[PDB]
């Protein structure tokens, strides 16, 4: 049965609610982005209307084989009427295709659902600038001051630099990058670009990336592993055993592997600066854990909410324990008293 925080009051609408069967009273199911925790339950046999971005829609069709008739893609930054309610999709700065959703209720309430997001000051000049928000359904993944990490751009600089150095010292080094969902594609695209190579990957992943509307994508990726000196592999294979085994497969073209695992936050962020990150090494194999986040840092979260000044905040992550819930309510109150709303 569907929890309260996935329902939109005074509408026939749910948000990311595909794993509870037929939700009593739902006329339209909204999917903010194509990550499995959020689409859990969708398949080719689902037969209600699904509202989403163009990108998300592409993945539903080709990856989950949802039929075309039940897919309703909407343009961003554009006012749209759905079951007689005005809605707007906004870019979430999460993974490809990820949206925030604005609902203009018939009673005059306005609700912002963030989906999964990474708060940015750029959002303070979207269509959010123009009016008030009563209720905010918030992505509270990192809602605690200990959660700090660099910008995406800093991380990318470290990675491009680390790869360019290693391969220029040893032209027979291979570079491997781990993946398990959509998101974080800049990591391996940036690395491939600096090395003048296409990114080589399984057929399943090539298919996934072909649904993302990235410009010039045919120029940047390939299933032909032999023609590539940057390879993608499943995240579970990014360890000494998995990499040794992959190097074998490459038929003596390479005598070294440098690999990256994009993580989210990890506790080495509580001490170490991005600059000072070092890898784990065993023999001819090095592995770097790099803190490339597609969710708000505590400070970025704090900024967006204090800017938006919502009347009520409903968290959508870390809702499972009383200690988590109480920690988040206290921060909300601090933020409100500091800002004056
Ligand atoms: Ni997500």
């Amino acid at each position: 049965t569907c929890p309260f925080y996935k329902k939109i009051p005074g509408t026939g609408f749910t948000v990311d609610a595909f794993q509870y069967g037929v939700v009593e009273g739902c006329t339209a199911y909204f999917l903010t982005h194509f990550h499995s925790d959020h689409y859990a339950g969708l398949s080719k046999h689902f037969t209600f209307p699904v509202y989403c971005s163009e990108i998300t829609g592409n993945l539903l069709k080709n990856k989950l084989h949802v039929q075309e008739q039940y897919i309703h893609p909407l343009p961003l930054d554009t006012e749209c009427i759905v079951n007689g309610v005005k809605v707007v999709l906004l870019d979430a700065n999460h993974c490809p295709g990820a949206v925030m959703i604005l609902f203009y209720l018939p009673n005059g309430t306005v609700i912002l659902h963030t989906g999964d997001f990474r708060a940015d000051p750029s959002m303070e000049r979207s269509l959010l600038a123009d009016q008030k928000v009563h209720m905010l359904y918030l992505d509270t993944t990192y809602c605690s001051p200990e959660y700090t990490f660099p910008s995406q751009q800093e991380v990318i600089r470290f990675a491009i630099n680390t790869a360019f150095e290693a391969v220029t010292l040893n032209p027979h080094a291979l570079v491997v990058c781990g993946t398990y969902s959509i998101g974080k594609e800049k990591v391996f695209l940036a690395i491939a670009d600096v090395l003048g190579s296409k990114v080589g990957m399984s057929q399943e992943k090539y298919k996934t990336l072909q649904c993302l509307n990235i410009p010039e994508i045919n120029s940047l990726i390939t299933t032909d592993m032999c023609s590539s000196l940057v390879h993608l592999l499943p995240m579970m294979q990014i360890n000494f055993k998995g990499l040794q085994s992959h190097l074998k497969k490459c038929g003596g073209k390479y005598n070294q592997i440098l690999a990256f695992r994009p993580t989210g936050w990890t506790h080495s962020n509580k001490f170490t600066r991005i600059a000072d990150v070092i890898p784990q090494t065993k023999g001819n194999i090095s592995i770097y854990g790099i803190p490339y986040s597609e969710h708000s840092s505590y400070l970025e979260m704090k900024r967006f909410v204090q800017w938006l000044k919502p009347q009520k905040i409903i968290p959508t992550v870390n809702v499972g324990t009383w200690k988590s819930r109480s920690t988040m309510e206290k921060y909300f109150r601090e933020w409100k008293l500091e800002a004056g709303y």
Side-chain angles (χ1 to χ4, degrees), residues 1-23 25-203 205-215 217-240 242-247 249-269 271-281 283-311 313-341:
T1 69
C2 184
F4 75 96
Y5 71 78
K6 294 176 175 268
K7 285 172 182 170
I8 302 304
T11 74
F13 305 155
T14 65
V15 181
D16 301 347
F18 300 94
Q19 55 149 325
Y20 314 100
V22 181
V23 180
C26 194
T27 51
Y29 300 75
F30 275 89
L31 179 59
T32 59
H33 64 301
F34 193 69
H35 270 170
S36 50
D37 277 1
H38 299 258
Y39 69 69
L42 274 167
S43 69
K44 74 150 66 159
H45 308 299
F46 201 81
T47 49
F48 293 99
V50 186
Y51 292 82
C52 65
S53 68
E54 171 184 350
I55 288 163
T56 293
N58 294 339
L59 297 149
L60 294 177
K61 180 192 172 176
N62 297 288
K63 289 311 272 195
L64 302 187
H65 297 295
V66 168
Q67 304 165 49
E68 203 147 64
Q69 72 185 130
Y70 309 104
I71 315 180
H72 299 263
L74 312 170
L76 303 188
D77 296 318
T78 308
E79 295 181 336
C80 285
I81 309 305
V82 172
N83 296 2
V85 179
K86 186 165 62 170
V87 308
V88 174
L89 304 198
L90 301 171
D91 194 276
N93 190 39
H94 187 55
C95 61
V99 300
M100 311 195 290
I101 306 154
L102 258 187
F103 300 97
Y104 297 86
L105 268 52
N107 70 5
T109 297
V110 184
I111 290 172
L112 181 65
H113 198 304
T114 70
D116 275 346
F117 89 147
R118 190 163 180 179
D120 198 69
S122 55
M123 298 178 168
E124 305 161 17
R125 298 169 283 284
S126 47
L127 309 201
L128 293 171
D130 318 33
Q131 98 287 260
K132 163 191 198 63
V133 168
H134 300 77
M135 307 191 92
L136 180 67
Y137 293 62
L138 179 66
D139 170 24
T140 48
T141 301
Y142 298 127
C143 192
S144 182
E146 76 282 10
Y147 298 117
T148 55
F149 31 75
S151 62
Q152 290 175 171
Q153 190 282 335
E154 273 173 280
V155 172
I156 286 306
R157 171 95 295 184
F158 174 82
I160 284 165
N161 289 2
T162 294
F164 179 74
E165 196 195 272
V167 167
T168 296
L169 299 164
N170 179 196
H172 307 275
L174 171 66
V175 175
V176 177
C177 293
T179 191
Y180 47 33
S181 55
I182 72 177
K184 308 191 184 188
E185 286 84 8
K186 190 65 179 185
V187 185
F188 52 86
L189 294 166
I191 293 167
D193 175 78
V194 79
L195 300 167
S197 177
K198 293 186 172 199
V199 183
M201 57 195 74
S202 81
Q203 292 182 259
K205 189 81 196 188
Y206 184 89
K207 189 183 186 191
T208 301
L209 298 183
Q210 284 295 167
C211 300
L212 304 190
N213 292 348
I214 292 167
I217 195 57
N218 297 330
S219 68
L220 320 168
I221 70 179
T222 188
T223 52
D224 179 7
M225 301 299 274
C226 281
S227 70
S228 179
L229 65 140
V230 179
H231 294 170
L232 301 198
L233 284 178
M235 196 70 89
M236 283 194 69
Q237 180 163 20
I238 314 301
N239 54 69
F240 304 118
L243 297 158
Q244 283 170 204
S245 179
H246 186 76
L247 189 53
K249 266 151 257 150
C250 295
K253 207 166 192 302
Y254 309 107
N255 59 15
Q256 182 187 337
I257 285 180
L258 175 121
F260 298 90
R261 305 188 315 90
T263 55
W265 175 99
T266 78
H267 191 62
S268 42
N269 276 296
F271 312 122
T272 323
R273 282 177 141 64
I274 185 56
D276 304 305
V277 166
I278 62 159
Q280 294 192 286
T281 303
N284 58 352
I285 303 191
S286 292
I287 301 174
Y288 279 90
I290 55 161
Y292 186 91
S293 180
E294 297 186 342
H295 297 271
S296 313
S297 82
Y298 166 88
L299 289 162
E300 291 157 355
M301 199 184 307
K302 177 170 179 289
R303 191 194 167 120
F304 177 82
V305 167
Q306 286 187 304
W307 175 85
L308 184 76
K309 299 173 170 52
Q311 294 188 344
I313 305 184
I314 297 163
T316 64
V317 185
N318 305 310
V319 294
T321 73
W322 299 113
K323 177 167 155 216
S324 288
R325 292 196 149 289
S326 180
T327 291
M328 298 179 297
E329 289 180 356
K330 281 161 63 236
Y331 291 119
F332 304 150
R333 183 60 64 177
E334 287 188 16
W335 297 348
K336 177 180 153 93
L337 293 166
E338 197 190 4
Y341 56 94

